[PDB]
Design an enzyme around this catalytic site. Structure first.
Site, PDB file in Angstrom:
ATOM      1  N   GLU A 177      -1.419  36.290 -52.184  1.00 41.14           N
ATOM      2  CA  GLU A 177      -2.844  36.607 -52.121  1.00 41.14           C
ATOM      3  C   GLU A 177      -3.587  35.608 -51.235  1.00 41.14           C
ATOM      4  O   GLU A 177      -3.386  34.396 -51.353  1.00 41.14           O
ATOM      5  CB  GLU A 177      -3.439  36.648 -53.537  1.00 41.14           C
TER       6      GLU A 177
ATOM      7  N   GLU B 222      -7.505  35.237 -48.537  1.00 38.41           N
ATOM      8  CA  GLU B 222      -8.944  35.493 -48.463  1.00 38.41           C
ATOM      9  C   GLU B 222      -9.267  36.902 -47.933  1.00 38.41           C
ATOM     10  O   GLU B 222     -10.118  37.583 -48.506  1.00 38.41           O
ATOM     11  CB  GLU B 222      -9.642  34.414 -47.613  1.00 38.41           C
ATOM     12  N   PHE B 223      -8.589  37.336 -46.856  1.00 37.16           N
ATOM     13  CA  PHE B 223      -8.827  38.640 -46.234  1.00 37.16           C
ATOM     14  C   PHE B 223      -7.723  39.684 -46.502  1.00 37.16           C
ATOM     15  O   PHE B 223      -7.693  40.736 -45.852  1.00 37.16           O
ATOM     16  CB  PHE B 223      -9.091  38.467 -44.729  1.00 37.16           C
ATOM     17  N   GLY B 224      -6.871  39.415 -47.489  1.00 36.96           N
ATOM     18  CA  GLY B 224      -5.794  40.324 -47.843  1.00 36.96           C
ATOM     19  C   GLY B 224      -4.878  39.916 -48.977  1.00 36.96           C
ATOM     20  O   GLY B 224      -5.028  38.837 -49.561  1.00 36.96           O
TER      21      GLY B 224
ATOM     22  N   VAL C  76      -0.468  40.738 -50.478  1.00 38.97           N
ATOM     23  CA  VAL C  76       0.883  41.292 -50.310  1.00 38.97           C
ATOM     24  C   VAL C  76       1.388  41.676 -51.704  1.00 38.97           C
ATOM     25  O   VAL C  76       1.383  40.843 -52.609  1.00 38.97           O
ATOM     26  CB  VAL C  76       1.862  40.349 -49.556  1.00 38.97           C
TER      27      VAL C  76
ATOM     28  N   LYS D 293      11.929  50.690 -51.879  1.00 41.23           N
ATOM     29  CA  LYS D 293      11.158  49.499 -52.259  1.00 41.23           C
ATOM     30  C   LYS D 293      10.410  49.001 -51.023  1.00 41.23           C
ATOM     31  O   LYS D 293      11.005  48.819 -49.954  1.00 41.23           O
ATOM     32  CB  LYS D 293      12.041  48.384 -52.853  1.00 41.23           C
TER      33      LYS D 293
ATOM     34  N   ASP E 226       0.649  34.993 -34.774  1.00 41.36           N
ATOM     35  CA  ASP E 226       0.916  34.253 -36.009  1.00 41.36           C
ATOM     36  C   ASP E 226       2.423  33.957 -36.205  1.00 41.36           C
ATOM     37  O   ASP E 226       2.948  34.093 -37.308  1.00 41.36           O
ATOM     38  CB  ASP E 226       0.290  34.985 -37.224  1.00 41.36           C
TER      39      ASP E 226
ATOM     40  N   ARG F 201       7.494  31.249 -41.880  1.00 42.15           N
ATOM     41  CA  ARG F 201       6.984  32.005 -43.043  1.00 42.15           C
ATOM     42  C   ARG F 201       6.777  33.512 -42.731  1.00 42.15           C
ATOM     43  O   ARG F 201       6.737  34.323 -43.657  1.00 42.15           O
ATOM     44  CB  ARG F 201       5.679  31.371 -43.587  1.00 42.15           C
ATOM     45  N   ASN F 202       6.600  33.867 -41.437  1.00 38.84           N
ATOM     46  CA  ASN F 202       6.419  35.253 -40.966  1.00 38.84           C
ATOM     47  C   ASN F 202       7.711  35.892 -40.440  1.00 38.84           C
ATOM     48  O   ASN F 202       7.689  37.032 -39.972  1.00 38.84           O
ATOM     49  CB  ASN F 202       5.284  35.345 -39.943  1.00 38.84           C
TER      50      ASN F 202
ATOM     51  N   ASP G 190       4.319  40.082 -39.759  1.00 41.57           N
ATOM     52  CA  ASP G 190       3.044  39.397 -39.909  1.00 41.57           C
ATOM     53  C   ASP G 190       2.530  39.598 -41.330  1.00 41.57           C
ATOM     54  O   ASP G 190       1.874  40.596 -41.623  1.00 41.57           O
ATOM     55  CB  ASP G 190       2.011  39.815 -38.853  1.00 41.57           C
TER      56      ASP G 190
HETATM   57  C1  LIG Z   1      -4.844  42.059 -34.206  1.00 45.64           C
HETATM   58  N1  LIG Z   1      -3.390  42.080 -34.202  1.00 45.64           N
HETATM   59  C2  LIG Z   1      -2.656  41.018 -34.519  1.00 45.64           C
HETATM   60  O1  LIG Z   1      -3.145  39.935 -34.840  1.00 45.64           O
HETATM   61  C3  LIG Z   1      -1.149  41.226 -34.459  1.00 45.64           C
HETATM   62  C4  LIG Z   1      -0.573  41.279 -35.902  1.00 45.64           C
HETATM   63  N2  LIG Z   1      -1.272  42.334 -36.630  1.00 45.64           N
HETATM   64  C5  LIG Z   1      -1.824  42.159 -37.837  1.00 45.64           C
HETATM   65  O2  LIG Z   1      -1.743  41.113 -38.480  1.00 45.64           O
HETATM   66  C6  LIG Z   1      -2.586  43.358 -38.401  1.00 45.64           C
HETATM   67  C7  LIG Z   1      -3.866  43.552 -37.582  1.00 45.64           C
HETATM   68  C8  LIG Z   1      -4.832  44.585 -38.158  1.00 45.64           C
HETATM   69  C9  LIG Z   1      -6.087  44.713 -37.328  1.00 45.64           C
HETATM   70  C10 LIG Z   1      -7.304  44.234 -37.803  1.00 45.64           C
HETATM   71  C11 LIG Z   1      -8.457  44.351 -37.040  1.00 45.64           C
HETATM   72  C12 LIG Z   1      -8.409  44.946 -35.793  1.00 45.64           C
HETATM   73  C13 LIG Z   1      -7.206  45.425 -35.310  1.00 45.64           C
HETATM   74  C14 LIG Z   1      -6.052  45.309 -36.073  1.00 45.64           C
HETATM   75  N3  LIG Z   1      -1.743  44.546 -38.368  1.00 45.64           N
HETATM   76  C15 LIG Z   1      -0.742  44.748 -39.246  1.00 45.64           C
HETATM   77  O3  LIG Z   1      -0.563  44.046 -40.246  1.00 45.64           O
HETATM   78  C16 LIG Z   1       0.165  45.881 -38.948  1.00 45.64           C
HETATM   79  C17 LIG Z   1      -0.210  47.202 -38.540  1.00 45.64           C
HETATM   80  C18 LIG Z   1      -1.569  47.780 -38.311  1.00 45.64           C
HETATM   81  N4  LIG Z   1       0.835  47.958 -38.360  1.00 45.64           N
HETATM   82  O4  LIG Z   1       1.965  47.150 -38.649  1.00 45.64           O
HETATM   83  C19 LIG Z   1       1.529  45.922 -38.993  1.00 45.64           C
HETATM   84  C20 LIG Z   1       2.555  44.936 -39.331  1.00 45.64           C
HETATM   85  S1  LIG Z   1       2.190  43.504 -40.180  1.00 45.64           S
HETATM   86  N5  LIG Z   1       3.786  42.983 -40.155  1.00 45.64           N
HETATM   87  N6  LIG Z   1       4.554  43.828 -39.545  1.00 45.64           N
HETATM   88  C21 LIG Z   1       3.904  44.932 -39.069  1.00 45.64           C
HETATM   89  C22 LIG Z   1       4.691  45.977 -38.347  1.00 45.64           C
HETATM   90  C23 LIG Z   1       0.923  41.527 -35.865  1.00 45.64           C
HETATM   91  C24 LIG Z   1       1.454  42.732 -36.310  1.00 45.64           C
HETATM   92  C25 LIG Z   1       2.817  42.965 -36.276  1.00 45.64           C
HETATM   93  C26 LIG Z   1       3.690  41.998 -35.794  1.00 45.64           C
HETATM   94  C27 LIG Z   1       5.162  42.252 -35.753  1.00 45.64           C
HETATM   95  F1  LIG Z   1       5.882  41.133 -35.860  1.00 45.64           F
HETATM   96  F2  LIG Z   1       5.542  42.815 -34.612  1.00 45.64           F
HETATM   97  F3  LIG Z   1       5.565  43.086 -36.710  1.00 45.64           F
HETATM   98  C28 LIG Z   1       3.162  40.792 -35.347  1.00 45.64           C
HETATM   99  C29 LIG Z   1       1.799  40.562 -35.382  1.00 45.64           C
END
Ligand SMILES: CNC(=O)C[C@@H](NC(=O)[C@@H](CCc1ccccc1)NC(=O)c1c(C)noc1-c1snnc1C)c1ccc(C(F)(F)F)cc1
Ligand SMILES: [Cl-]
Ligand SMILES: [Cl-]
Length: 264
Positions: A20, A22-24, A26, A40, A142, A146-147, A160
């Site tokens: 948990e 501030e902005f989300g 898991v 799962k 990011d 940890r990611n 992420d």
């Molecule tokens: C802004 N964009 C980032 O800062 C990149 C970042 N995105 C986010 O943190 C968030 C961003 C959400 C957002 C908020 C406001 C405006 C636009 C978008 N989006 C996801 O959480 C996400 C989505 C939408 N669709 O899939 C995943 C995720 S999160 N982890 N894996 C996936 C595939 C991210 C996502 C995925 C990866 C990867 F490793 F390839 F899987 C790396 C980094």
């Protein structure tokens, strides 16, 4: 854009909170699939700026873009759910994140002592994942141990799970709003150091507020004790002052594969 990634909310069952912020948050969950089986899942809930439609549009655009991504070293996006609260559905991985794994490996009940050959394969896996994203001009923003997630076959994939990282941020990104692929390369160098040290926090003895001045004076993460000179040479090249002088993920991946293949 919506129709390609959006999964019906009644197909998802939410469980306990894993993490948990501030902005989300898991959470562990169950997703009923098309073939009639339940998988799962890890559910990443995100608080979007609903004062305009810019964040929801940019969210759905990124989700539609990610659905089409397919690489073994990149976490697979199963889809999204809307409760206006967006939820990112990813596969659940029992071995968890790489940072925690490295730390458990140093304790008796945790996994066995990780050999150098395995530590370097973890790095190649991340480089392969990052090379795939960098080729499609996708910025991680990011990257940290940890990611990085461990799949059931012990292969590493980029993800992420961030819910908001000064010690991972490139020098140019601390000075300006600027963030490119070469900034992800800096974070990768730091991720490599985290792996080589088996989970140490970057820059021991350096505070978060001193970081910009510390980097500006030419100081960088020190070479770990059990670290090969060739490996430290690869991670140091990630921290060159000028982003243009840093190698691409494609160059980094091959250097790591060549170094891994030279070991017994
Ligand atoms: C802004 N964009 C980032 O800062 C990149 C970042 N995105 C986010 O943190 C968030 C961003 C959400 C957002 C908020 C406001 C405006 C636009 C978008 N989006 C996801 O959480 C996400 C989505 C939408 N669709 O899939 C995943 C995720 S999160 N982890 N894996 C996936 C595939 C991210 C996502 C995925 C990866 C990867 F490793 F390839 F899987 C790396 C980094
Ligand atoms: Cl430690
Ligand atoms: Cl250091």
């Amino acid at each position: 854009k919506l129709e390609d990634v959006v999964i019906d909310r009644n197909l998802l069952i939410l469980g306990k909170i894993l993490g948990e912020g501030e902005f989300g948050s898991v959470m562990e969950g169950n997703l009923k699939q098309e073939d009639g089986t339940s998988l799962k899942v890890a559910v990443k809930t995100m608080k979007l700026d609903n004062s305009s439609q810019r964040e929801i549009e940019e969210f759905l655009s990124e989700a539609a873009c990610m659905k089409d991504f397919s690489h073994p070293n990149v976490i697979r996006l199963l889809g999204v759910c809307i409760e206006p609260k967006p939820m990112v559905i990813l596969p659940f991985m029992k071995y968890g994140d790489l940072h925690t794994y490295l730390l458990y490996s140093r304790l008796e009940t945790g996994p066995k002592h990780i050999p150098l050959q395995t530590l370097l394969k973890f790095m190649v896996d991340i480089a392969l994942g990052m090379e795939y994203l960098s080729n499609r001009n996708f910025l991680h923003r990011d990257l940290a141990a940890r990611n990085c997630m461990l799949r059931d076959d012990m292969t590493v994939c980029v993800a992420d799970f961030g819910l908001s990282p000064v010690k991972w941020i490139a020098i140019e990104s601390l000075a300006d709003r600027v963030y490119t692929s070469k900034s992800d390369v800096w974070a990768f160098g730091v991720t490599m150091w985290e792996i080589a040290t088996r989970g140490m926090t970057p820059y021991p003895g350096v505070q978060n507020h001193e970081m910009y001045d510390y980097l500006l004076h030419g100081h960088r993460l020190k070479q770990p004790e059990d670290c090969l000179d060739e490996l430290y040479e690869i991670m140091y090249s990630c921290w060159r002052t000028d982003p243009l002088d840093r190698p691409t993920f494609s160059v980094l991946r091959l250097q790591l594969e060549k170094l891994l293949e030279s070991l017994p």
